[PDB]
Design a protein around this motif. Structure first.
Motif, PDB file in Angstrom:
ATOM      1  N   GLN A   1       8.109   1.736   4.596  1.00  0.00           N
ATOM      2  CA  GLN A   1       7.706   2.130   3.256  1.00  0.00           C
ATOM      3  C   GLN A   1       6.683   1.168   2.639  1.00  0.00           C
ATOM      4  N   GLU A   2       6.853  -0.132   2.892  1.00  0.00           N
ATOM      5  CA  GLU A   2       5.930  -1.161   2.396  1.00  0.00           C
ATOM      6  C   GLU A   2       4.561  -1.014   3.031  1.00  0.00           C
ATOM      7  N   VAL A   3       4.560  -0.572   4.274  1.00  0.00           N
ATOM      8  CA  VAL A   3       3.336  -0.328   5.023  1.00  0.00           C
ATOM      9  C   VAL A   3       2.488   0.733   4.313  1.00  0.00           C
ATOM     10  N   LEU A   4       3.159   1.715   3.743  1.00  0.00           N
ATOM     11  CA  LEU A   4       2.504   2.812   3.042  1.00  0.00           C
ATOM     12  C   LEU A   4       1.734   2.293   1.818  1.00  0.00           C
ATOM     13  N   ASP A   5       2.375   1.404   1.053  1.00  0.00           N
ATOM     14  CA  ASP A   5       1.770   0.818  -0.162  1.00  0.00           C
ATOM     15  C   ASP A   5       0.571  -0.031   0.199  1.00  0.00           C
ATOM     16  N   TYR A   6       0.719  -0.741   1.280  1.00  0.00           N
ATOM     17  CA  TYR A   6      -0.277  -1.659   1.783  1.00  0.00           C
ATOM     18  C   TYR A   6      -1.494  -0.920   2.338  1.00  0.00           C
ATOM     19  N   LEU A   7      -1.242   0.210   2.974  1.00  0.00           N
ATOM     20  CA  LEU A   7      -2.251   0.941   3.730  1.00  0.00           C
ATOM     21  C   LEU A   7      -3.472   1.315   2.898  1.00  0.00           C
ATOM     22  N   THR A   8      -3.293   2.176   1.939  1.00  0.00           N
ATOM     23  CA  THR A   8      -4.397   2.580   1.115  1.00  0.00           C
ATOM     24  C   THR A   8      -4.153   2.188  -0.340  1.00  0.00           C
ATOM     25  N   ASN A   9      -3.221   2.869  -0.956  1.00  0.00           N
ATOM     26  CA  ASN A   9      -2.889   2.651  -2.362  1.00  0.00           C
ATOM     27  C   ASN A   9      -1.427   2.418  -2.490  1.00  0.00           C
ATOM     28  N   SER A  10      -1.029   1.573  -3.388  1.00  0.00           N
ATOM     29  CA  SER A  10       0.366   1.341  -3.552  1.00  0.00           C
ATOM     30  C   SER A  10       1.039   2.378  -4.462  1.00  0.00           C
ATOM     31  N   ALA A  11       0.613   2.469  -5.704  1.00  0.00           N
ATOM     32  CA  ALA A  11       1.344   3.280  -6.666  1.00  0.00           C
ATOM     33  C   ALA A  11       0.940   4.736  -6.655  1.00  0.00           C
ATOM     34  N   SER A  12      -0.325   4.998  -6.473  1.00  0.00           N
ATOM     35  CA  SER A  12      -0.810   6.366  -6.521  1.00  0.00           C
ATOM     36  C   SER A  12      -0.517   7.107  -5.215  1.00  0.00           C
ATOM     37  N   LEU A  13      -0.197   6.359  -4.188  1.00  0.00           N
ATOM     38  CA  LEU A  13       0.046   6.921  -2.887  1.00  0.00           C
ATOM     39  C   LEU A  13       1.560   7.089  -2.600  1.00  0.00           C
ATOM     40  N   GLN A  14       2.431   6.920  -3.613  1.00  0.00           N
ATOM     41  CA  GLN A  14       3.908   6.854  -3.365  1.00  0.00           C
ATOM     42  C   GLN A  14       4.501   8.091  -2.659  1.00  0.00           C
ATOM     43  N   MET A  15       4.042   9.273  -2.979  1.00  0.00           N
ATOM     44  CA  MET A  15       4.524  10.464  -2.266  1.00  0.00           C
ATOM     45  C   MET A  15       3.418  11.047  -1.397  1.00  0.00           C
ATOM     46  N   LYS A  16       2.234  10.558  -1.634  1.00  0.00           N
ATOM     47  CA  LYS A  16       1.008  10.968  -0.950  1.00  0.00           C
ATOM     48  C   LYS A  16       0.823  10.258   0.387  1.00  0.00           C
ATOM     49  N   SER A  17       1.780   9.461   0.790  1.00  0.00           N
ATOM     50  CA  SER A  17       1.557   8.510   1.856  1.00  0.00           C
ATOM     51  C   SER A  17       1.354   9.173   3.221  1.00  0.00           C
ATOM     52  N   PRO A  18       0.393   8.616   3.979  1.00  0.00           N
ATOM     53  CA  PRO A  18       0.083   8.988   5.358  1.00  0.00           C
ATOM     54  C   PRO A  18       1.280   8.861   6.284  1.00  0.00           C
ATOM     55  N   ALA A  19       1.200   9.509   7.404  1.00  0.00           N
ATOM     56  CA  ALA A  19       2.272   9.508   8.332  1.00  0.00           C
ATOM     57  C   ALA A  19       1.864   8.719   9.544  1.00  0.00           C
ATOM     58  N   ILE A  20       2.737   7.838   9.960  1.00  0.00           N
ATOM     59  CA  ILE A  20       2.464   6.959  11.054  1.00  0.00           C
ATOM     60  C   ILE A  20       3.304   7.384  12.227  1.00  0.00           C
ATOM     61  N   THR A  21       2.678   7.498  13.346  1.00  0.00           N
ATOM     62  CA  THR A  21       3.335   7.872  14.535  1.00  0.00           C
ATOM     63  C   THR A  21       3.038   6.798  15.580  1.00  0.00           C
ATOM     64  N   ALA A  22       4.020   6.426  16.329  1.00  0.00           N
ATOM     65  CA  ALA A  22       3.845   5.383  17.332  1.00  0.00           C
ATOM     66  C   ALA A  22       4.463   5.778  18.650  1.00  0.00           C
ATOM     67  N   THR A  23       3.909   5.313  19.731  1.00  0.00           N
ATOM     68  CA  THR A  23       4.498   5.588  21.001  1.00  0.00           C
ATOM     69  C   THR A  23       5.321   4.369  21.416  1.00  0.00           C
ATOM     70  N   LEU A  24       6.545   4.617  21.784  1.00  0.00           N
ATOM     71  CA  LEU A  24       7.467   3.569  22.097  1.00  0.00           C
ATOM     72  C   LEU A  24       8.100   3.883  23.449  1.00  0.00           C
ATOM     73  N   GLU A  25       7.843   3.003  24.418  1.00  0.00           N
ATOM     74  CA  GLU A  25       8.351   3.119  25.791  1.00  0.00           C
ATOM     75  C   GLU A  25       7.978   4.458  26.447  1.00  0.00           C
ATOM     76  N   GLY A  26       6.776   4.917  26.154  1.00  0.00           N
ATOM     77  CA  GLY A  26       6.254   6.131  26.746  1.00  0.00           C
ATOM     78  C   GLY A  26       6.696   7.398  26.048  1.00  0.00           C
ATOM     79  N   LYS A  27       7.402   7.266  24.960  1.00  0.00           N
ATOM     80  CA  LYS A  27       7.817   8.418  24.201  1.00  0.00           C
ATOM     81  C   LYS A  27       7.205   8.336  22.813  1.00  0.00           C
ATOM     82  N   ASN A  28       6.876   9.468  22.237  1.00  0.00           N
ATOM     83  CA  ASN A  28       6.237   9.482  20.936  1.00  0.00           C
ATOM     84  C   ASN A  28       7.288   9.490  19.850  1.00  0.00           C
TER      85      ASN A  28
END
Length: 97
Positions: A17-44
């Motif tokens: 959640q903190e990553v979301l605030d940090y990413l672009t905007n903190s307060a204006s992006l609270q529900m607007k936040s981007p989605a982060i997807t990561a691959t972990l051990e060959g699985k998404n």
């Protein structure tokens, strides 16, 4: 966009959640936040959407957990998709200690 990953530094105790605030905007992006997807051990693994199974309930367990608890490590690449940007951006997550 850029196909080379953008680098960001986080402390292992920081939440997704903190990553979301940090990413672009903190307060204006609270529900607007981007989605982060990561691959972990060959699985998404989706880190923003609840792809994490949780005990009892936990409304947003993935957001509530830290990057370290999510299994993220320094050098890990994150793929983020954003609502304000029509591009997928790659990030490298670097942990400070």
């Amino acid at each position: 966009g850029s196909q080379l990953p953008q680098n960001i530094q986080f402390s292992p105790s920081a939440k997704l959640q903190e990553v979301l605030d940090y990413l672009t905007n903190s307060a204006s992006l609270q529900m607007k936040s981007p989605a982060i997807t990561a691959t972990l051990e060959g699985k998404n693994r989706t880190l923003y959407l609840q792809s994490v199974t949780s005990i009892e309930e936990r409304t947003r367990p993935n957001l509530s957990k830290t990057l370290k608890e999510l299994g993220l490590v320094d050098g890990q690449e994150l793929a983020v998709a954003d609502v304000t940007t029509p591009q997928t951006v790659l990030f490298k997550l670097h942990f400070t200690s």
